[PDB]
């Protein structure tokens, strides 16, 4: 019983993000996780970020209390600059600079994460993995849902989800999902707002043809907090021995952040006969973003402010409890088009059944940037001596003062105007030959990644075309009792947008991974358990120039090797459980400035476990009680490994009551509380001047009704 029970467990056994063909998870020679709509509806995650919380190999709350982006550090790696490596419907949501798009989980059918190299099917990519969200689609049966949310910090949400067939044979059906949300962010003076509508339409002329129109529109007046805090006053105590309170805000009173998303496309598939099927995926999007932001830049005594006049103008002991600040003014617009066409050839060679995949992937991205950035001494200073049992106890924090984002002094600030172009075209081939219990996957892909940046201010143009090749091979020995052992080799590549000492675009970095493991996907039991160990290596990483030159040099190499185990299974008819453990060994293997160091923000040990319980007996029938905990190990807060952010464990709880016992079947009411013990933690730090307070205990009531 209960939607998220074995019904989800099993549905989650299938996926395509691993092989670009509908394969059962144990037949995929690579690490992959799946979270369902029922699952997401139970936990009510703020973003896809949380939705993946009980998955191994993923730091998902790195930025802490911020929700602006959906950045994930998978297996200790991320894309250059920390740009999202997020996919939607098999097509990438390409972004640039501060222009990345996000998707509300209320518009998703499910989310999936694939670990390690994946270029063999998607082209240029961060060695570590990629997230792939699936848009909600028109349903077979009717759906009339309205949802109401009320929570802390003045969180108020209201949305709907409607799906129906236009004819009685289902050849014509739609779906319309929309939500309105507004709330105050953890940090004083920050707000969050969002309006999203997803129009979808399906067309099934017959039973071997499907064309579904997928669109999304989202408007966000205010994005929320995305600032930086010094390790001094967060991880470590201030000279006065106190700390900045979790709701502290160091930006202007007039800081502003907005994102605009518009996209249309479709998912198509046609089964010609018994040996041929073809599917194409296309999407076009125009997204915009803007901000007027004052961010922190460490305390005056931080090396980063060695050249700060305002900073030196203070007594040597004050430099340690004064915060330096810089700013930015950004305006961006980008259009992104994508099409992936694939032909599936099903056949065999006597006991050698084949599944030949061959297709072409294409994409182009254009992002126009017009920003302005304040450097040293471009904005005031803040005397962090404001912890006190006042701003902690009483109104945790006092908003700061305004700030002139106009009249940009040529002395302390400057303009930034860039136009980036990106184009990628790849062709791939992959066969899945199963020889009765001996499934073997082997494929390849050739990519054409071409980039071109125009510096409107310098009147300069940097360009580079790359030509790469990646292949993957693996074998799964599917037993018949459940236990499915596997292993595989995999490659990945990622072009560089950086320019070197010579004035050229660095060569692409590459991903090399060896992984072995076993998967338990028994068919007679609603349970699934996995475990794997891997050795993933990225090469030609950009490192400091051997002789300090302001420019970087390639050659750097990093290695990440670890163990991941995931487990999901129904223990009774009312008790479900989910959990995983992650052991990550990330290390600098070749770097001028570092070496033997572990990159920042990546803990060595990671773990999480969750379980729920529903009643089908007494007056407490239909009552669901669930709870879980997420543990984050210690991590370094900078490449230099000069200090360390400590480990933490947050607990979440929910009480759901199946309102069906009042006649309203399919409707229910829930209460969710995050960080129950309202712990206080520093999520992570990317450096000494870039740390983030974790999320402070939240409480949300959710009334969802089905007609
Ligand atoms: C490869 O280096 C990347 C590391 C990422 O990771 C993080 C977590 O680590 C750092 C930062 C990160 O975000 C920094 C950061 O953000 C700073 N500002 C950037 C601009 O806006 C305000 C904040 C920042 C730093 O000093 C930062 C810093 O020291 C560290 C270690 N500003 C300044 O000193 C000031 C006062 C002005 C600079 C102006 C120009 C415009 C920039 O020089 C630009 C040409 C380019 O150099 C960067 C954008 C570069 O980006 C790319 O090359 C690809 O672009 C992206 O992917 C950008 C992007 C970053 N994030 C986190 C999210 C989305 C997009 C970053 C440095
Ligand atoms: C009909 C589906 C195939 C779409 C092919 C898209 C063509 C993109 C142009 C390729 N190239 C970059 C080499 O000019
Ligand atoms: Mg090349
Ligand atoms: Na295989």
PDB file of C-alpha atoms in Angstrom, residues 111-379:
ATOM      1  CA  UNK A 111      14.801  12.312 -11.454  1.00  0.00           C
ATOM      2  CA  UNK A 112      17.893  10.275 -12.227  1.00  0.00           C
ATOM      3  CA  UNK A 113      21.633  10.559 -11.523  1.00  0.00           C
ATOM      4  CA  UNK A 114      24.322   8.719 -13.472  1.00  0.00           C
ATOM      5  CA  UNK A 115      27.797   8.559 -11.892  1.00  0.00           C
ATOM      6  CA  UNK A 116      31.167   8.821 -13.606  1.00  0.00           C
ATOM      7  CA  UNK A 117      31.945   9.457 -17.313  1.00  0.00           C
ATOM      8  CA  UNK A 118      28.932   9.466 -19.656  1.00  0.00           C
ATOM      9  CA  UNK A 119      30.240  11.113 -22.796  1.00  0.00           C
ATOM     10  CA  UNK A 120      29.689   7.868 -24.689  1.00  0.00           C
ATOM     11  CA  UNK A 121      26.069   9.002 -24.942  1.00  0.00           C
ATOM     12  CA  UNK A 122      25.857  12.751 -24.202  1.00  0.00           C
ATOM     13  CA  UNK A 123      29.093  14.375 -25.404  1.00  0.00           C
ATOM     14  CA  UNK A 124      31.173  16.896 -23.438  1.00  0.00           C
ATOM     15  CA  UNK A 125      30.665  16.423 -19.702  1.00  0.00           C
ATOM     16  CA  UNK A 126      32.115  16.689 -16.216  1.00  0.00           C
ATOM     17  CA  UNK A 127      33.655  13.385 -15.179  1.00  0.00           C
ATOM     18  CA  UNK A 128      31.380  12.507 -12.301  1.00  0.00           C
ATOM     19  CA  UNK A 129      27.919  12.233 -13.745  1.00  0.00           C
ATOM     20  CA  UNK A 130      24.815  14.139 -14.741  1.00  0.00           C
ATOM     21  CA  UNK A 131      21.300  14.687 -13.454  1.00  0.00           C
ATOM     22  CA  UNK A 132      18.386  13.978 -15.773  1.00  0.00           C
ATOM     23  CA  UNK A 133      14.894  15.150 -14.866  1.00  0.00           C
ATOM     24  CA  UNK A 134      11.831  13.824 -16.656  1.00  0.00           C
ATOM     25  CA  UNK A 135       8.913  16.156 -17.434  1.00  0.00           C
ATOM     26  CA  UNK A 136       5.471  15.117 -16.201  1.00  0.00           C
ATOM     27  CA  UNK A 137       3.425  13.776 -19.129  1.00  0.00           C
ATOM     28  CA  UNK A 138      -0.277  13.424 -19.996  1.00  0.00           C
ATOM     29  CA  UNK A 139      -1.800  10.482 -18.138  1.00  0.00           C
ATOM     30  CA  UNK A 140      -4.010   7.613 -19.262  1.00  0.00           C
ATOM     31  CA  UNK A 141      -6.534   8.136 -16.449  1.00  0.00           C
ATOM     32  CA  UNK A 142      -7.949  11.512 -15.359  1.00  0.00           C
ATOM     33  CA  UNK A 143      -6.253  13.838 -12.884  1.00  0.00           C
ATOM     34  CA  UNK A 144      -7.547  16.923 -11.082  1.00  0.00           C
ATOM     35  CA  UNK A 145      -5.181  18.090  -8.353  1.00  0.00           C
ATOM     36  CA  UNK A 146      -4.924  21.329  -6.398  1.00  0.00           C
ATOM     37  CA  UNK A 147      -2.252  21.796  -3.727  1.00  0.00           C
ATOM     38  CA  UNK A 148      -1.852  24.260  -0.845  1.00  0.00           C
ATOM     39  CA  UNK A 149       1.278  24.959   1.165  1.00  0.00           C
ATOM     40  CA  UNK A 150       1.890  27.100   4.237  1.00  0.00           C
ATOM     41  CA  UNK A 151       5.136  27.142   6.213  1.00  0.00           C
ATOM     42  CA  UNK A 152       7.807  29.041   8.149  1.00  0.00           C
ATOM     43  CA  UNK A 153       9.467  32.238   6.900  1.00  0.00           C
ATOM     44  CA  UNK A 154       6.114  33.086   5.315  1.00  0.00           C
ATOM     45  CA  UNK A 155       6.273  30.327   2.720  1.00  0.00           C
ATOM     46  CA  UNK A 156       3.013  30.291   0.759  1.00  0.00           C
ATOM     47  CA  UNK A 157       2.432  28.004  -2.189  1.00  0.00           C
ATOM     48  CA  UNK A 158      -0.534  27.153  -4.366  1.00  0.00           C
ATOM     49  CA  UNK A 159      -0.476  24.895  -7.423  1.00  0.00           C
ATOM     50  CA  UNK A 160      -2.386  22.505  -9.658  1.00  0.00           C
ATOM     51  CA  UNK A 161      -1.917  19.473 -11.875  1.00  0.00           C
ATOM     52  CA  UNK A 162      -4.549  18.553 -14.468  1.00  0.00           C
ATOM     53  CA  UNK A 163      -4.454  15.783 -17.058  1.00  0.00           C
ATOM     54  CA  UNK A 164      -7.140  14.353 -19.334  1.00  0.00           C
ATOM     55  CA  UNK A 165      -7.912  12.689 -22.676  1.00  0.00           C
ATOM     56  CA  UNK A 166      -9.789  14.608 -25.365  1.00  0.00           C
ATOM     57  CA  UNK A 167     -11.184  11.455 -27.015  1.00  0.00           C
ATOM     58  CA  UNK A 168     -12.360   8.163 -25.528  1.00  0.00           C
ATOM     59  CA  UNK A 169      -9.561   6.222 -27.244  1.00  0.00           C
ATOM     60  CA  UNK A 170      -6.716   8.328 -25.842  1.00  0.00           C
ATOM     61  CA  UNK A 171      -5.337   9.525 -29.150  1.00  0.00           C
ATOM     62  CA  UNK A 172      -5.513  13.053 -27.711  1.00  0.00           C
ATOM     63  CA  UNK A 173      -4.495  13.975 -24.161  1.00  0.00           C
ATOM     64  CA  UNK A 174      -2.970  16.915 -22.284  1.00  0.00           C
ATOM     65  CA  UNK A 175      -1.540  17.999 -18.954  1.00  0.00           C
ATOM     66  CA  UNK A 176      -1.236  21.396 -17.304  1.00  0.00           C
ATOM     67  CA  UNK A 177       0.836  21.899 -14.180  1.00  0.00           C
ATOM     68  CA  UNK A 178       1.355  25.249 -12.491  1.00  0.00           C
ATOM     69  CA  UNK A 179       2.470  26.664  -9.153  1.00  0.00           C
ATOM     70  CA  UNK A 180       2.733  30.030  -7.410  1.00  0.00           C
ATOM     71  CA  UNK A 181       5.240  30.387  -4.590  1.00  0.00           C
ATOM     72  CA  UNK A 182       6.668  33.135  -2.390  1.00  0.00           C
ATOM     73  CA  UNK A 183       8.645  33.065   0.826  1.00  0.00           C
ATOM     74  CA  UNK A 184      11.314  34.828   2.831  1.00  0.00           C
ATOM     75  CA  UNK A 185      14.842  33.419   2.642  1.00  0.00           C
ATOM     76  CA  UNK A 186      16.811  32.333   5.718  1.00  0.00           C
ATOM     77  CA  UNK A 187      18.991  35.471   5.510  1.00  0.00           C
ATOM     78  CA  UNK A 188      17.486  38.841   6.533  1.00  0.00           C
ATOM     79  CA  UNK A 189      16.073  40.909   3.699  1.00  0.00           C
ATOM     80  CA  UNK A 190      16.059  38.122   1.124  1.00  0.00           C
ATOM     81  CA  UNK A 191      12.949  36.920  -0.646  1.00  0.00           C
ATOM     82  CA  UNK A 192      12.052  34.097  -3.007  1.00  0.00           C
ATOM     83  CA  UNK A 193       9.279  34.123  -5.592  1.00  0.00           C
ATOM     84  CA  UNK A 194       8.209  31.808  -8.387  1.00  0.00           C
ATOM     85  CA  UNK A 195       5.593  31.315 -11.067  1.00  0.00           C
ATOM     86  CA  UNK A 196       5.663  28.157 -13.198  1.00  0.00           C
ATOM     87  CA  UNK A 197       3.346  26.605 -15.769  1.00  0.00           C
ATOM     88  CA  UNK A 198       4.098  23.474 -17.814  1.00  0.00           C
ATOM     89  CA  UNK A 199       1.858  22.874 -20.829  1.00  0.00           C
ATOM     90  CA  UNK A 200       2.142  19.300 -22.219  1.00  0.00           C
ATOM     91  CA  UNK A 201       0.301  17.485 -25.019  1.00  0.00           C
ATOM     92  CA  UNK A 202       0.423  13.845 -26.206  1.00  0.00           C
ATOM     93  CA  UNK A 203      -0.686  12.260 -29.486  1.00  0.00           C
ATOM     94  CA  UNK A 204      -1.034   8.496 -29.999  1.00  0.00           C
ATOM     95  CA  UNK A 205      -2.377   7.875 -33.560  1.00  0.00           C
ATOM     96  CA  UNK A 206      -1.907   4.167 -32.871  1.00  0.00           C
ATOM     97  CA  UNK A 207      -0.044   1.911 -30.437  1.00  0.00           C
ATOM     98  CA  UNK A 208       3.434   2.164 -31.986  1.00  0.00           C
ATOM     99  CA  UNK A 209       3.541   5.952 -32.344  1.00  0.00           C
ATOM    100  CA  UNK A 210       3.835   8.697 -29.697  1.00  0.00           C
ATOM    101  CA  UNK A 211       4.469  12.446 -29.967  1.00  0.00           C
ATOM    102  CA  UNK A 212       4.449  14.494 -26.782  1.00  0.00           C
ATOM    103  CA  UNK A 213       4.722  18.288 -26.738  1.00  0.00           C
ATOM    104  CA  UNK A 214       6.643  19.480 -23.703  1.00  0.00           C
ATOM    105  CA  UNK A 215       6.819  23.116 -22.665  1.00  0.00           C
ATOM    106  CA  UNK A 216       7.817  25.008 -19.523  1.00  0.00           C
ATOM    107  CA  UNK A 217       7.584  28.670 -18.514  1.00  0.00           C
ATOM    108  CA  UNK A 218       8.941  30.068 -15.256  1.00  0.00           C
ATOM    109  CA  UNK A 219       9.324  33.556 -13.861  1.00  0.00           C
ATOM    110  CA  UNK A 220      11.319  34.464 -10.770  1.00  0.00           C
ATOM    111  CA  UNK A 221      11.281  38.142  -9.685  1.00  0.00           C
ATOM    112  CA  UNK A 222      13.544  37.337  -6.731  1.00  0.00           C
ATOM    113  CA  UNK A 223      15.887  34.331  -6.548  1.00  0.00           C
ATOM    114  CA  UNK A 224      17.139  34.595  -2.963  1.00  0.00           C
ATOM    115  CA  UNK A 225      20.484  34.534  -1.157  1.00  0.00           C
ATOM    116  CA  UNK A 226      23.679  33.532  -2.992  1.00  0.00           C
ATOM    117  CA  UNK A 227      26.348  35.298  -0.929  1.00  0.00           C
ATOM    118  CA  UNK A 228      29.634  34.422   0.722  1.00  0.00           C
ATOM    119  CA  UNK A 229      30.730  34.366   4.335  1.00  0.00           C
ATOM    120  CA  UNK A 230      34.254  34.259   5.829  1.00  0.00           C
ATOM    121  CA  UNK A 231      35.420  31.175   7.699  1.00  0.00           C
ATOM    122  CA  UNK A 232      35.900  33.746  10.458  1.00  0.00           C
ATOM    123  CA  UNK A 233      32.485  34.039  12.081  1.00  0.00           C
ATOM    124  CA  UNK A 234      31.198  30.756  10.687  1.00  0.00           C
ATOM    125  CA  UNK A 235      33.526  27.744  10.838  1.00  0.00           C
ATOM    126  CA  UNK A 236      35.852  29.510  13.270  1.00  0.00           C
ATOM    127  CA  UNK A 237      35.093  32.075  15.992  1.00  0.00           C
ATOM    128  CA  UNK A 238      35.515  35.803  15.477  1.00  0.00           C
ATOM    129  CA  UNK A 239      38.328  37.493  17.343  1.00  0.00           C
ATOM    130  CA  UNK A 240      35.744  38.399  20.015  1.00  0.00           C
ATOM    131  CA  UNK A 241      35.058  34.661  20.311  1.00  0.00           C
ATOM    132  CA  UNK A 242      31.515  34.852  18.873  1.00  0.00           C
ATOM    133  CA  UNK A 243      29.967  34.076  15.471  1.00  0.00           C
ATOM    134  CA  UNK A 244      27.741  35.450  12.712  1.00  0.00           C
ATOM    135  CA  UNK A 245      24.193  34.090  13.129  1.00  0.00           C
ATOM    136  CA  UNK A 246      22.827  31.694  10.462  1.00  0.00           C
ATOM    137  CA  UNK A 247      20.339  34.317   9.234  1.00  0.00           C
ATOM    138  CA  UNK A 248      23.052  36.954   8.810  1.00  0.00           C
ATOM    139  CA  UNK A 249      23.060  38.789   5.500  1.00  0.00           C
ATOM    140  CA  UNK A 250      26.054  40.756   4.277  1.00  0.00           C
ATOM    141  CA  UNK A 251      24.584  42.076   1.040  1.00  0.00           C
ATOM    142  CA  UNK A 252      22.890  45.400   0.331  1.00  0.00           C
ATOM    143  CA  UNK A 253      19.337  46.142   1.395  1.00  0.00           C
ATOM    144  CA  UNK A 254      18.727  46.561  -2.312  1.00  0.00           C
ATOM    145  CA  UNK A 255      20.393  43.379  -3.615  1.00  0.00           C
ATOM    146  CA  UNK A 256      18.342  41.867  -6.421  1.00  0.00           C
ATOM    147  CA  UNK A 257      18.319  38.528  -8.279  1.00  0.00           C
ATOM    148  CA  UNK A 258      15.982  37.358 -11.058  1.00  0.00           C
ATOM    149  CA  UNK A 259      15.721  34.387 -13.456  1.00  0.00           C
ATOM    150  CA  UNK A 260      13.496  33.919 -16.510  1.00  0.00           C
ATOM    151  CA  UNK A 261      12.850  30.579 -18.249  1.00  0.00           C
ATOM    152  CA  UNK A 262      10.971  29.813 -21.500  1.00  0.00           C
ATOM    153  CA  UNK A 263      11.115  26.531 -23.438  1.00  0.00           C
ATOM    154  CA  UNK A 264       9.211  24.410 -25.972  1.00  0.00           C
ATOM    155  CA  UNK A 265       9.870  21.017 -27.528  1.00  0.00           C
ATOM    156  CA  UNK A 266       8.780  17.389 -27.860  1.00  0.00           C
ATOM    157  CA  UNK A 267       9.528  13.750 -27.204  1.00  0.00           C
ATOM    158  CA  UNK A 268       8.897  11.417 -30.136  1.00  0.00           C
ATOM    159  CA  UNK A 269       9.043   7.690 -30.726  1.00  0.00           C
ATOM    160  CA  UNK A 270       7.789   5.389 -33.452  1.00  0.00           C
ATOM    161  CA  UNK A 271       7.929   1.618 -33.678  1.00  0.00           C
ATOM    162  CA  UNK A 272       8.098   0.828 -37.399  1.00  0.00           C
ATOM    163  CA  UNK A 273       7.997  -2.957 -37.226  1.00  0.00           C
ATOM    164  CA  UNK A 274       9.579  -5.720 -35.130  1.00  0.00           C
ATOM    165  CA  UNK A 275      13.186  -4.781 -35.834  1.00  0.00           C
ATOM    166  CA  UNK A 276      13.070  -0.991 -36.130  1.00  0.00           C
ATOM    167  CA  UNK A 277      12.051   1.813 -33.779  1.00  0.00           C
ATOM    168  CA  UNK A 278      13.084   5.459 -33.916  1.00  0.00           C
ATOM    169  CA  UNK A 279      12.984   8.163 -31.304  1.00  0.00           C
ATOM    170  CA  UNK A 280      13.858  11.848 -31.479  1.00  0.00           C
ATOM    171  CA  UNK A 281      14.102  14.436 -28.676  1.00  0.00           C
ATOM    172  CA  UNK A 282      14.023  18.165 -29.361  1.00  0.00           C
ATOM    173  CA  UNK A 283      13.813  21.386 -27.338  1.00  0.00           C
ATOM    174  CA  UNK A 284      14.396  25.106 -27.748  1.00  0.00           C
ATOM    175  CA  UNK A 285      14.860  27.581 -24.893  1.00  0.00           C
ATOM    176  CA  UNK A 286      15.448  31.249 -24.196  1.00  0.00           C
ATOM    177  CA  UNK A 287      16.473  31.987 -20.595  1.00  0.00           C
ATOM    178  CA  UNK A 288      17.458  35.220 -18.874  1.00  0.00           C
ATOM    179  CA  UNK A 289      18.933  36.264 -15.553  1.00  0.00           C
ATOM    180  CA  UNK A 290      19.785  39.510 -13.739  1.00  0.00           C
ATOM    181  CA  UNK A 291      21.308  40.677 -10.469  1.00  0.00           C
ATOM    182  CA  UNK A 292      22.455  43.656  -8.381  1.00  0.00           C
ATOM    183  CA  UNK A 293      24.562  41.909  -5.785  1.00  0.00           C
ATOM    184  CA  UNK A 294      26.933  42.812  -2.989  1.00  0.00           C
ATOM    185  CA  UNK A 295      28.742  39.674  -1.796  1.00  0.00           C
ATOM    186  CA  UNK A 296      31.242  39.149   0.993  1.00  0.00           C
ATOM    187  CA  UNK A 297      34.938  38.736   0.266  1.00  0.00           C
ATOM    188  CA  UNK A 298      36.443  37.513   3.521  1.00  0.00           C
ATOM    189  CA  UNK A 299      37.670  39.478   6.514  1.00  0.00           C
ATOM    190  CA  UNK A 300      40.374  42.106   6.021  1.00  0.00           C
ATOM    191  CA  UNK A 301      43.075  39.858   7.473  1.00  0.00           C
ATOM    192  CA  UNK A 302      42.450  37.364   4.658  1.00  0.00           C
ATOM    193  CA  UNK A 303      45.165  37.099   1.958  1.00  0.00           C
ATOM    194  CA  UNK A 304      42.455  37.876  -0.598  1.00  0.00           C
ATOM    195  CA  UNK A 305      42.453  41.460   0.679  1.00  0.00           C
ATOM    196  CA  UNK A 306      46.200  42.075   0.634  1.00  0.00           C
ATOM    197  CA  UNK A 307      45.722  45.012  -1.734  1.00  0.00           C
ATOM    198  CA  UNK A 308      42.618  46.483  -0.101  1.00  0.00           C
ATOM    199  CA  UNK A 309      43.211  50.101   0.877  1.00  0.00           C
ATOM    200  CA  UNK A 310      40.134  50.207   3.118  1.00  0.00           C
ATOM    201  CA  UNK A 311      41.496  47.103   4.805  1.00  0.00           C
ATOM    202  CA  UNK A 312      45.055  48.320   5.415  1.00  0.00           C
ATOM    203  CA  UNK A 313      43.597  51.542   6.832  1.00  0.00           C
ATOM    204  CA  UNK A 314      42.826  49.598  10.041  1.00  0.00           C
ATOM    205  CA  UNK A 315      44.759  48.527  13.134  1.00  0.00           C
ATOM    206  CA  UNK A 316      46.497  45.139  12.490  1.00  0.00           C
ATOM    207  CA  UNK A 317      44.135  43.462  14.984  1.00  0.00           C
ATOM    208  CA  UNK A 318      40.926  44.829  13.412  1.00  0.00           C
ATOM    209  CA  UNK A 319      41.680  43.309  10.022  1.00  0.00           C
ATOM    210  CA  UNK A 320      40.393  40.051  11.508  1.00  0.00           C
ATOM    211  CA  UNK A 321      36.832  41.070  12.356  1.00  0.00           C
ATOM    212  CA  UNK A 322      35.952  43.365   9.469  1.00  0.00           C
ATOM    213  CA  UNK A 323      34.345  42.004   6.292  1.00  0.00           C
ATOM    214  CA  UNK A 324      35.414  43.117   2.824  1.00  0.00           C
ATOM    215  CA  UNK A 325      32.735  43.283   0.151  1.00  0.00           C
ATOM    216  CA  UNK A 326      32.611  43.442  -3.653  1.00  0.00           C
ATOM    217  CA  UNK A 327      29.696  43.556  -6.080  1.00  0.00           C
ATOM    218  CA  UNK A 328      28.210  42.630  -9.433  1.00  0.00           C
ATOM    219  CA  UNK A 329      25.592  43.853 -11.906  1.00  0.00           C
ATOM    220  CA  UNK A 330      24.618  41.263 -14.477  1.00  0.00           C
ATOM    221  CA  UNK A 331      22.176  40.959 -17.381  1.00  0.00           C
ATOM    222  CA  UNK A 332      22.063  37.840 -19.554  1.00  0.00           C
ATOM    223  CA  UNK A 333      19.999  36.335 -22.337  1.00  0.00           C
ATOM    224  CA  UNK A 334      20.578  32.941 -23.927  1.00  0.00           C
ATOM    225  CA  UNK A 335      18.869  30.669 -26.451  1.00  0.00           C
ATOM    226  CA  UNK A 336      19.541  26.925 -26.498  1.00  0.00           C
ATOM    227  CA  UNK A 337      18.415  24.447 -29.171  1.00  0.00           C
ATOM    228  CA  UNK A 338      18.859  20.671 -29.053  1.00  0.00           C
ATOM    229  CA  UNK A 339      17.942  17.549 -31.067  1.00  0.00           C
ATOM    230  CA  UNK A 340      18.977  13.973 -30.536  1.00  0.00           C
ATOM    231  CA  UNK A 341      17.871  11.405 -33.051  1.00  0.00           C
ATOM    232  CA  UNK A 342      18.322   7.691 -32.473  1.00  0.00           C
ATOM    233  CA  UNK A 343      17.522   4.525 -34.417  1.00  0.00           C
ATOM    234  CA  UNK A 344      17.057   1.283 -32.498  1.00  0.00           C
ATOM    235  CA  UNK A 345      17.846  -1.952 -34.305  1.00  0.00           C
ATOM    236  CA  UNK A 346      16.676  -5.084 -32.515  1.00  0.00           C
ATOM    237  CA  UNK A 347      17.983  -8.391 -33.862  1.00  0.00           C
ATOM    238  CA  UNK A 348      20.382 -11.263 -33.185  1.00  0.00           C
ATOM    239  CA  UNK A 349      23.077 -13.692 -34.271  1.00  0.00           C
ATOM    240  CA  UNK A 350      21.871 -17.040 -32.966  1.00  0.00           C
ATOM    241  CA  UNK A 351      21.743 -16.812 -29.166  1.00  0.00           C
ATOM    242  CA  UNK A 352      23.535 -13.511 -29.685  1.00  0.00           C
ATOM    243  CA  UNK A 353      20.624 -11.110 -29.347  1.00  0.00           C
ATOM    244  CA  UNK A 354      21.472  -7.526 -30.263  1.00  0.00           C
ATOM    245  CA  UNK A 355      20.193  -4.057 -29.463  1.00  0.00           C
ATOM    246  CA  UNK A 356      22.071  -1.738 -31.801  1.00  0.00           C
ATOM    247  CA  UNK A 357      21.867   1.948 -30.945  1.00  0.00           C
ATOM    248  CA  UNK A 358      23.010   4.502 -33.467  1.00  0.00           C
ATOM    249  CA  UNK A 359      22.181   8.182 -33.451  1.00  0.00           C
ATOM    250  CA  UNK A 360      23.259  11.778 -33.872  1.00  0.00           C
ATOM    251  CA  UNK A 361      23.250  14.412 -31.162  1.00  0.00           C
ATOM    252  CA  UNK A 362      23.208  18.142 -31.880  1.00  0.00           C
ATOM    253  CA  UNK A 363      23.160  21.381 -29.859  1.00  0.00           C
ATOM    254  CA  UNK A 364      24.026  25.068 -29.977  1.00  0.00           C
ATOM    255  CA  UNK A 365      24.129  27.599 -27.174  1.00  0.00           C
ATOM    256  CA  UNK A 366      24.314  31.375 -27.254  1.00  0.00           C
ATOM    257  CA  UNK A 367      24.573  33.594 -24.164  1.00  0.00           C
ATOM    258  CA  UNK A 368      25.027  37.379 -24.297  1.00  0.00           C
ATOM    259  CA  UNK A 369      26.572  38.923 -21.174  1.00  0.00           C
ATOM    260  CA  UNK A 370      26.533  42.558 -20.056  1.00  0.00           C
ATOM    261  CA  UNK A 371      27.816  42.869 -16.508  1.00  0.00           C
ATOM    262  CA  UNK A 372      29.773  45.203 -14.265  1.00  0.00           C
ATOM    263  CA  UNK A 373      32.056  44.141 -11.383  1.00  0.00           C
ATOM    264  CA  UNK A 374      33.359  45.977  -8.348  1.00  0.00           C
ATOM    265  CA  UNK A 375      36.900  45.086  -7.260  1.00  0.00           C
ATOM    266  CA  UNK A 376      38.898  46.026  -4.162  1.00  0.00           C
ATOM    267  CA  UNK A 377      37.534  48.979  -2.202  1.00  0.00           C
ATOM    268  CA  UNK A 378      34.449  49.134  -4.426  1.00  0.00           C
ATOM    269  CA  UNK A 379      31.974  48.905  -1.534  1.00  0.00           C
TER     270      UNK A 379
END
